[PDB]
Design a protein around this ligand. Structure first.
Ligand SMILES: [Cl-]
Length: 831
């Protein structure tokens, strides 16, 4: 088409990322803005508020973010990288919406000669005046930096030698690297700061008078400090797994000291929080302290409150955590209500008001890889009734979750609610299928299906939380293919060990037996054998299923090989499935096998593609149901299908006969099969005409068969299968087709106009649009690196010109090639 017409239809943009960012390294939180901050090893900074409020930034040096400090009240933040550099970020409103940008940077450097092991920043303390940064270092010296306009203030430095001179003789036995471990401001006096050193010396320092007001020397090595809200109590934690309480009123002794998980030797308690409540029952949250021999491998955060104590246990390393408190600066009590934990593989939020401390559902930042993703499947425009029933069944399985509204709700989302409901289904290694709301900026878990059901298999107070599982139990359960009929609520899922399940949406629970049917694909091949995966043992007798997608029939391929293709026709109530050996058709109404076809006689018979079509196979006048299969060797099989009417659906059996066998002479694997109607419009989905008679295919004009191989596109006329058009992609451009999907491209110049075209993902990671029906290449975009074999394998298209691919094991990148779609965040955040 003309280039002016291309610009109304096609335009490539990567718009948003969905999921849990790879390898987090720092956590920050602003209690005034109610906004979460996450830094990564790659130098990324990511901010989150209410759903729709999110920002991303990148440090120019791609070094790990180690600390994030959102300035009190202000719309600013200071990050620290592992190269010891500090950076000042801000949220300025440009164009009525907020945006994140880096203002300045600063590397604290000592006089030439001083080792870097001395100027290494340990603690960053933003002063309540919002004008000064106090910087503790491994040498024991506290430096002061002005804000904004980064400038060190050498006259305000608090050195270790200046502190030790104000102290008695027995408190002066310093180490070479005093190592500032704590650096805090008095909660009720901006003139006093606490400095804590590794060897156990803690001082309270009068900034204006340059003198020590208070000090103690703990018996154990110091790890961290917490200053009670009123400033009259200090809690320290130590390298032997103990913590002490200290009064603040000179040179005192501990009020209390204990190793919470003794008497065994314990690992350090590395962070501790002491939080008051109006009810007079304080919270004690601390990280670590595990018995070294039996639990040293554990990633724990313990919570003590009102005689109750739980050691929350996470399956990945704790990167950082925070506790949301009802209190603002003025409040007398802290009153915690949520514990937010950033682990290396997931975010976890705990409700601290509700007894039992239940988890909070995530609206975003979901660990898509809590079981490894093995396939995906996108469905656009969901019927509202089906959508509500999915969401309903999701709530029923999430009853153990807290009812607390999402607390990290800062900012204001400026984007209207999505007009269209999109679903992204993910298949996983453990046999689960998750239903994600892919409509807008936030990818939210709506419902989870577990297919493992149909097959056969206190001190410290550990409680396992989170969802990430690092262990691979049974790879046979892995979901390979997914087909959801958004009209009938039927669902077909296919697995790694030849298992094919057809399921149906149900509002209520059910107790039923899953009917098992074997599909032997080597029936006409004696002497064969199967090396490897034994079939999954199915549950005999009835099984109880919660509300959701409930399986009623299991088709077990023999041999139980990886199911390599799947198609479901919800109107004819048939399911087709392929393996490396052959393919077969199954009547899931009668729960009987219609036919089975082996493909190993002229891998090569490897069935890549399956496609139902009501089109012309023999005569130009009558159009019958049909199934099409494409193989790795360029072969296309077509089967005429006799489907009884509604009344006779259970009385007479469905009949099939091989009507066509087309061979592509270039002999490349068939990746896509499609039929266009008389107006060259692709045939509609099953039950789409039943729900919309305007989509009834044109039977007046001649139908055309589109076959896409890895090397070529080809259009034949039906029923003769006479060649009409072709595009030799690999010959022309040197690229190979990885996958291809039909996509409707609407015009941005005409409100209600659009054309169907082919979205094509190549083995070079490119994304091409090939026109229909003429097979002319329209646009080619760079998207995924050609070396990114996992990202290319994970890429999935939408029906209307969007797409998703995995940039990491745990998050998608959303791209759009259509001018009608641009799902990006737009939000406002102010103080
Ligand atoms: Cl463009």
């Amino acid at each position: 088409m003309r280039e002016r017409l291309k610009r109304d239809l096609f335009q490539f943009n990567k718009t948003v990322e969905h999921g849990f960012p790879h390898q987090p390294s720092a956590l920050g939180y602003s209690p005034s803005l109610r906004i979460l901050a996450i830094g990564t090893r790659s130098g990324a900074i990511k901010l989150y508020g209410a759903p729709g409020v999110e920002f991303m930034g990148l440090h120019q040096e791609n070094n790990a973010v180690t600390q994030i400090h959102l300035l009190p009240g202000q719309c600013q933040l200071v990050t620290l990288l592992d190269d010891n550099s500090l950076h000042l970020w801000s949220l300025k409103v440009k164009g009525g919406a907020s945006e994140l940008q880096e203002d300045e940077s600063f590397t604290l450097r000592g006089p030439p000669g001083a080792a870097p092991s001395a100027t290494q920043i340990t603690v960053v303390l933003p002063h309540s005046s919002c004008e000064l940064l106090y910087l503790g270092t491994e040498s024991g010296n506290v430096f002061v930096v002005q804000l904004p306009a980064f400038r060190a203030l050498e006259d305000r430095t608090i050195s270790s030698d200046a502190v030790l001179q104000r102290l008695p003789e027995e408190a002066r036995h310093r180490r070479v690297f005093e190592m500032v471990e704590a650096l805090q401001e008095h909660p009720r006096d901006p003139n006093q700061i606490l400095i804590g050193y590794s060897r156990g010396l803690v001082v309270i320092w009068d900034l204006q008078g340059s003198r020590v007001l208070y000090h103690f020397l703990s018996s154990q090595q110091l790890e961290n400090i917490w200053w009670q809200r009123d400033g009259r109590l200090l809690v320290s934690c130590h390298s032997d797994g103990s913590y002490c309480q200290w009064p603040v009123s000179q040179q005192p002794e501990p009020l209390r000291s204990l190793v919470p998980y003794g008497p065994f030797p314990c690992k350090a308690i590395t962070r501790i929080l002491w939080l008051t409540t109006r009810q007079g029952l304080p919270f004690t949250i601390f990280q670590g302290g595990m018995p070294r021999a039996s639990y040293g491998d554990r990633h724990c955060i313990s919570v003590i409150h009102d005689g109750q104590q739980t050691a929350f246990d996470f399956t990945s390393r704790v990167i950082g955590f925070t506790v949301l408190t009802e209190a603002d600066p003025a409040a007398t009590f802290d009153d915690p209500y949520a514990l937010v934990v950033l682990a290396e593989e997931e975010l976890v939020v705990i409700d601290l008001q509700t007894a039992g401390w239940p988890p909070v559902q995530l609206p975003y930042l979901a660990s898509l890889h809590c079981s490894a993703i093995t396939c995906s499947h996108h469905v656009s425009n969901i019927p509202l009734k089906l959508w509500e029933r999915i969401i309903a069944a999701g709530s029923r399985q999430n009853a153990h979750f807290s009812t607390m509204e999402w607390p990290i709700d800062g900012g204001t989302s400026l984007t209207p609610a999505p007009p269209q409901r999109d679903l992204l289904l993910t298949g996983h290694e453990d046999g689960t299928v998750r239903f994600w709301d892919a409509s807008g900026v936030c990818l939210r878990l709506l419902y989870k299906l577990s297919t493992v059901r149909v097959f056969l298999t206190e001190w410290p107070p550990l409680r396992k939380v989170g969802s990430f599982d690092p262990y691979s139990d049974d790879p046979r359960l892995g979901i390979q293919k997914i087909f959801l009929c958004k009209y009938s609520g039927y669902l077909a899922v296919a697995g790694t060990a030849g298992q094919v399940l057809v399921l149906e949406l149900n509002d209520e629970a059910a107790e039923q037996a899953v009917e098992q049917v074997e599909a032997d694909l080597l029936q006409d091949q004696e002497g064969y054998r199967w090396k490897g995966h034994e079939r999954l043992a199915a549950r005999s007798g009835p099984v109880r299923f919660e509300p959701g997608f409930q399986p009623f029939v299991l088709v077990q391929c023999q041999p139980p090989a990886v199911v390599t293709s799947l198609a479901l026709h919800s109107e004819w109530r048939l399911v087709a499935f392929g393996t490396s050996h052959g393919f077969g058709l199954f009547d899931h109404q009668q729960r009987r096998q219609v036919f089975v076809k082996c493909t190993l006689h002229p891998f090569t018979g490897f069935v890549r593609t399956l496609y139902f079509a009501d089109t012309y196979l023999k005569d130009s006048s009558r159009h019958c149901p049909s199934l099409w299969a494409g193989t790795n060797g360029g072969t296309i099989y077509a089967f005429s299908l006799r489907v009884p009417p509604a009344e006779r659906r259970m009385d007479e059996p469905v009949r099939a006969e091989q009507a066509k066998e087309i061979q592509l002479m270039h002999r490349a694997p068939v990746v896509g099969i499609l039929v266009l109607d008389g107006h060259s419009v692709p045939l509609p989905e099953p039950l789409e005409v039943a729900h919309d008679l305007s989509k009834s295919p044109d039977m007046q004009g001649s139908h055309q068969l589109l076959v896409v191989s890895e090397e070529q596109f080809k259009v034949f006329t039906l029923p003769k299968v006479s060649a009409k058009l072709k595009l030799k992609l690999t010959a022309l451009e040197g690229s190979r087709v990885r996958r291809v999907s039909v996509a409707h491209f609407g015009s941005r110049r005409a409100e209600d106009y659009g054309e169907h075209h082919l979205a094509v993902l190549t083995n070079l990671g490119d994304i091409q649009v090939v026109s229909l029906p003429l097979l002319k290449p329209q646009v080619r975009y760079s998207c995924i690196r050609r070396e990114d074999v996992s990202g290319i394998a994970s890429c999935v298209f939408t029906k209307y010109g969007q797409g998703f691919y995995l940039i990491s094991p745990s998050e998608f990148e959303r791209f759009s090639l259509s001018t009608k779609w641009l799902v990006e965040p737009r939000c406002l955040v102010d103080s």
